[PDB]
Amino acid sequence: HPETLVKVKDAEDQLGARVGYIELDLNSGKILESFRPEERFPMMSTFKVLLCGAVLSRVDAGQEQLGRRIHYSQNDLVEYSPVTEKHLTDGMTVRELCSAAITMSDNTAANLLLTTIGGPKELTAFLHNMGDHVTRLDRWEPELNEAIPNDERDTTMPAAMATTLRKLLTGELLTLASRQQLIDWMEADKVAGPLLRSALPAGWFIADKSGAAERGSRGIIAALGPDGKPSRIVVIYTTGSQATMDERNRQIAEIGASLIKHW
């Protein structure tokens, strides 16, 4: 609804930085509303969902096992690894690593998973192979969060990310069991409270993944809908703002409140 674009454009005004947005019908794939849908924005941690998508694809093909255990060390740890820093002694399984990467946005967990698939180059090849000729991962944690202005490395477009998430959650790309595992991890997301979740009505469903990076970068991808079932996909990205993390969270939350009100 146009009233939500009032809030989205107001957000760009208030943050003094570009905001990208897109609301997509989950079933039909129809773009319901958008703003700067085909401009690039740093993906930040939202790529962790595509990473686990690639891992689940390998699992389905018999090239990976969710129960496989990976051992790592203190020197493997990078900034913000709330879960992995607690399992140095006995390691973690691939499944436990995706849970940490998606639900807590654990950076070391993401790097360990990236390593299992061949690195950023292979995640990007996986994406292109499934029809996303825009989204690209080029670096590892922490560098992929640099958000250099005009840099295409580690970026996506709101439209491309929405379509990709749609295929990942509902297409034949992944088996039913695997696609459910992916959305189960997103639904259990624990670090995106101040965002869309703060505007979700009682009884509604949401599976999401947030992101934060340098230069005011913030964003979130989500599948949400009434009566415990997702029916639309929402993608919101912003970069360039000098606003505080709270101000950025509030704007995303207010965009959420508007799209819910006009559902």
Ligand SMILES: *[B]([O])([O])[C][N]C(=O)/C(=N\OC([C])([C])C([O])=O)C1=[C]SC([N])=N1
């Ligand atoms: B992903 O985008 O969620 C990974 N994000 C981060 O590692 C960064 N911040 O995450 C914490 C510390 C949890 C936060 O408070 O948002 C991050 C990387 S570069 C930067 N300025 N922030």
Ligand SMILES: [K+]
């Ligand atoms: K509409």
Ligand SMILES: [K+]
């Ligand atoms: K429209």
Ligand SMILES: [K+]
């Ligand atoms: K160890």
Ligand SMILES: [K+]
């Ligand atoms: K330990």
Ligand SMILES: [K+]
């Ligand atoms: K900063």
